[PDB]
Amino acid sequence: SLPDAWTVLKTRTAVRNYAKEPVDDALIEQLLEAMLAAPTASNRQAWSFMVVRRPAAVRRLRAFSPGVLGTPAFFVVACVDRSLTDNLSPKLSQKIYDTSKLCVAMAVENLLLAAHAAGLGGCPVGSFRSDIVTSMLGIPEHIEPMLVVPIGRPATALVPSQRRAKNEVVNYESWGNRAA
Amino acid sequence: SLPDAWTVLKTRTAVRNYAKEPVDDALIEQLLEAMLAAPTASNRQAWSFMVVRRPAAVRRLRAFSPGVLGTPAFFVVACVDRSLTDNLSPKLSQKIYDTSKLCVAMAVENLLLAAHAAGLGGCPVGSFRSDIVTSMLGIPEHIEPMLVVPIGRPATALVPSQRRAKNEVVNYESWGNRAA
Amino acid sequence: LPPQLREEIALLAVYLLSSGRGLLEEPADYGIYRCTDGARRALQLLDEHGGSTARLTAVRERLDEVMFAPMGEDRDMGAILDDLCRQMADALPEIETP
Amino acid sequence: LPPQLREEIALLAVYLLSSGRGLLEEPADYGIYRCTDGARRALQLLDEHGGSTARLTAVRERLDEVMFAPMGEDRDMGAILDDLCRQMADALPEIETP
Ligand SMILES: *Cc1cc2c(cc1C)nc1c(=O)[nH]c(=O)nc-1n2C[C@H](O)[C@H](O)[C@H](O)COP(=O)(O)O
Ligand SMILES: *Cc1cc2c(cc1C)nc1c(=O)[nH]c(=O)nc-1n2C[C@H](O)[C@H](O)[C@H](O)COP(=O)(O)O
């Protein structure tokens, strides 16, 4: 049955080994519909996304993305649309341009959560050659790629990571009060 | 029963009207545990978070955050820990300092999803006086606040937003192919 | 050369070139994994076309575990690389061309 | 796979493994040339078996000049790597398998 949200949120782990079995189009569309519900600053929706899944294009994009391990079923590339963020002085441009990316990261998180709830896996990758993919995909100059995320079915069992204890990263009512 | 993840992901809406009924501590701890499962770059966990809920402190932080509407049950402040991101030239510092914030936004998204699945509401707020809250909470100089998010029980019924059609923001295999 | 094989070598060349450029904007302990992942991809190229005998596979399977392990684990990269070099040296005579 | 071809891939794997280990006892600007020399050897593998069309060769010949230049020359490694990535990207469609 569809998973309860709380178990799903804790269980999501970065998946880097993907299996050869492909993902059908209806599931891709449903995941993309689930991932667009993220918040956006002032309802502006200053973002662009792209879906690459053809067997040759996924492997050509994988080469120019050294941080990607394993060959996924399809690629989703998330970008920030700069056309709808320039105004007045460049100070306001920087102010409304950092905030634009802060909202794009949330959409990627939503996408990974949706693709994990369905039995697949994914991992955001930031180490990629920006200009080359912009030239290859025909992305205009006013659209800036930010994150390349692969999605696919895990090939091996999931293994959690090791994280610092809650006390270390969280404080109550004052810096240093890791008890209250 | 606990909600299926797919219905919950689509339904999350920004909540700005919160009710006076407070949230008990066990729920706060469970939401904080659910929100720490976000991905972090190279497993570094270069972030800090703080929980403010005392009735006086929430209202004093609310004044210095003009973008916050309504009085929530408690406040969660998410910051990026800069101590674990400086190295070699400042170019690498910028490279590993933007990526650090990109991962902090995902934790906020996880927190909102977890607090919506429980029957509460929340909305990320970026328009706040950074220096004043840093002085008030005792946050050291190497920790930079990024986002202030209120959490609480919605006072009125939820109302979705108006979003551009899927065709407008999504392209398949090339820039301009909003059909495939 | 088979067309699929021809593509695989060229895409390996792009990865090494792209990794080399992207090493100027990444930490100092990153050329270790790029070369380790490069050796993983070369051996993965062999057994996908039937060129791995019995030990050329046992190195690519151990390279997989090191590469796919969760990040942050304290692994003695010097010791494992030394072992893999020793194993791979013992496997070359099996495929030596006279 | 031809026996000579099989050896060439495996010896490429040894070079990447050996370079990765020997990067712990060498300067910080050395993973740049190991990856650049790795891309040189992969493309040198193609034209030795007739797999370089017209531009897969023009990159391996420019990689030769950069690699075989006398040491100490002040070369903007970022600019040339960017150009070579751009050239190699334009050459992939010529060898694309449908
Ligand atoms: C992503 C983001 C959303 C924000 C931000 C900042 C960022 C980086 N700041 C906001 C703020 O200061 N005030 C405020 O009211 N909302 C802020 N939001 C959220 C955004 O405005 C809404 O979420 C959106 O406009 C409505 O979409 P919805 O479907 O959630 O109702
Ligand atoms: C938030 C983030 C995570 C990344 C990024 C970039 C950003 C902004 N880039 C990655 C990359 O290039 N390669 C890669 O393998 N992972 C990247 N990640 C994710 C992160 O490394 C892992 O998610 C994390 O280290 C493991 O945590 P886990 O609990 O999900 O296993």
Residue numbers in the entry:
A (entry chain B), B (entry chain A): 13 to 192
C (entry chain D), D (entry chain C): 8 to 105
Question: What text does the study give?
Answer:
3D helical reconstruction yielded a map with a global resolution of 3.14 Å where a single C2 symmetrical dimer of AlbA (AlbA2) and a single C2 symmetrical dimer of AlbB (AlbB2) form a heterotetramer representing the biologically relevant asymmetric unit of the filament. The AlbAB filament lacked rotational symmetry along the long axis, instead exhibiting repeating units of AlbA2 and AlbB2 with a helical rise of 46 Å per AlbA2 and AlbB2, a helical twist of 120°, a helical pitch of 138 Å, and an overall diameter of 100 Å. One FMN cofactor per AlbA monomer could be unambiguously localized in our cryo-EM density. Masked local refinement containing one AlbA2 and two surrounding AlbB2 units yielded an improved 2.78 Å map allowing confident model building for the dimers AlbA2 and AlbB2 as well as the bound FMN cofactors. The AlbA monomer consists of five α helices and four anti-parallel β strands. AlbA dimer formation is mediated by extensive interactions between helix α4 of both monomers, which is further stabilized by interactions with helix α1. AlbB forms a dimeric 8-helix bundle with each monomer containing four α helices arranged in an anti-parallel orientation similar to four-helix bundle proteins. The AlbB dimer is formed through extensive intermolecular interactions of 35 residues contained within helices α1, α2, and α4 in a knobs-into-holes packing scheme often found in four-helix bundle or coiled-coil proteins. The most significant inter-dimer interactions occur between helix α3 of AlbA and helices α1 and α2 of AlbB. The FMN binding site is located at the interface of the AlbA2 and AlbB2 dimers, with clearly visible cryo-EM density corresponding to an 8α-S-cysteinyl linkage between the side chain thiol of C115 of AlbA and the C8 carbon of FMN. The positively charged AlbA residues R24, R28, and R175 are highly conserved and coordinate the phosphate group of the FMN ribityl chain.
